[PDB]
């Protein structure tokens, strides 16, 4: 009977580096460790590591090495979050034409409007969301929309390249040379924090989808919601679900708690990211002399939000205090 490699599921040679692995995964690990390798994933940090596809993702193979513990049908809630995850939209940008600061921001505002029309559909598909009161459903989307869109932008930018670039859409990516000109240096620094943190943390697709759901449940009204008790239960369901994603990712790493600390610390830092992004957004919206265009969808949210952040009618929910 054939003993299998706990990394690629190929006939194992022995107990290499604590884990029962095959000769090839054993040498791959030793090479990747002492070669101090920086492996970037072409997928979403969860590629299948099997005998044929072990050559494919070395970033994932080195993760399945560490989740095994190397050293020197029934649909789950997250499987649903994957299925309801929106398709990536195009800015419809005429890239073969001269660029402008106004043109890029207007295009991006219009794209963000289409994204909101998609994020509302995505929101309704989250088990439990349609179960809250309508004034709560609207408030959750009104509070956490920039949080949603910037977190998703970070994932799209993380996936698109190891270089610092904001992948807003496949046809509207702003390279480091362009994001550092004075017209947009500071705004891009906040949007780039998300992709660099997801990068640093090697956030898997499962952990990402759960954190994105938790971003929708990250802000509540100062005097609470109408269906607050249900909201707390739903919020806590997805925190239990993010922990399940961390158990799947780390496997036998022992750092499940440490992983959760970092991801929840990031979920908290999203308030600061959004607060910065919102300040540019509102400032621009109200500045008549700029004359940048905003979609009817977003302009209704922004106008019905500006006198709420200033009036402290928001209770930012934090894991860390």
């Amino acid at each position: 009977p054939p003993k299998l490699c706990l990394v690629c599921s190929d006939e194992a040679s022995g107990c290499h580096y604590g884990v029962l692995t095959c000769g090839s995964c054993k040498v791959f690990f030793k090479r990747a460790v002492e070669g101090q390798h920086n492996y970037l994933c072409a997928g979403r940090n969860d590629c299948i590591i099997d005998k044929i596809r072990r050559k494919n993702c070395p970033a994932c193979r080195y993760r399945k090495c560490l989740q095994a513990g190397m050293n020197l049908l029934t649909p789950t809630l997250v499987s649903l979050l994957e299925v309801i995850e929106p398709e990536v939209l195009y800015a419809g940008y005429d890239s073969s034409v001269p660029d402008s600061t106004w043109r890029i921001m207007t295009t991006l505002n219009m794209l963000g409007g289409r994204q909101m029309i998609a994020a509302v559909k995505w929101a309704k598909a989250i088990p439990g969301f349609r179960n809250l009161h309508l004034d709560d459903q609207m408030t959750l989307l009104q509070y956490s929309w920039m949080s949603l869109m910037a977190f998703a932008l970070g994932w799209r930018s993380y996936r698109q390249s190891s270089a610092n670039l904001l992948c807003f859409a496949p046809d509207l990516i702003i390279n480091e040379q362009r994001m550092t000109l004075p017209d947009m240096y500071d705004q891009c620094k906040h949007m780039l924090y998300v992709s660099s943190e997801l990068h640093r943390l090697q956030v898997s697709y499962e952990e990402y989808l759960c954190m994105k759901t938790l971003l929708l449940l990250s802000s509540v009204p100062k005097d609470g919601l109408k269906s607050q008790e249900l909201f707390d239960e739903i919020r806590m369901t997805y925190i239990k679900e993010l922990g399940k994603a961390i158990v799947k990712r780390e496997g036998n790493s022992s750092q499940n708690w440490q992983r959760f600390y970092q991801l929840t610390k990031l979920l908290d830092s999203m308030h600061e990211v959004v607060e910065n992004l919102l300040n540019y957004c509102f400032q621009t919206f109200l500045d008549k002399t700029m004359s940048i265009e905003f979609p009817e969808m977003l302009a209704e949210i922004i106008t019905n939000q500006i006198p709420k952040y200033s009036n402290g009618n928001i209770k930012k929910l934090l894991f860390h205090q």
Binding site: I117, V120, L141, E296, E300, N304
Partner: peptide, 12 residues
């Protein structure tokens, strides 16, 4: 009235 968000929310 109402907002496009409210209109889009209850639209099954």
């Amino acid at each position: 009235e109402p907002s496009l968000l409210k209109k889009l929310l209850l639209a099954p």
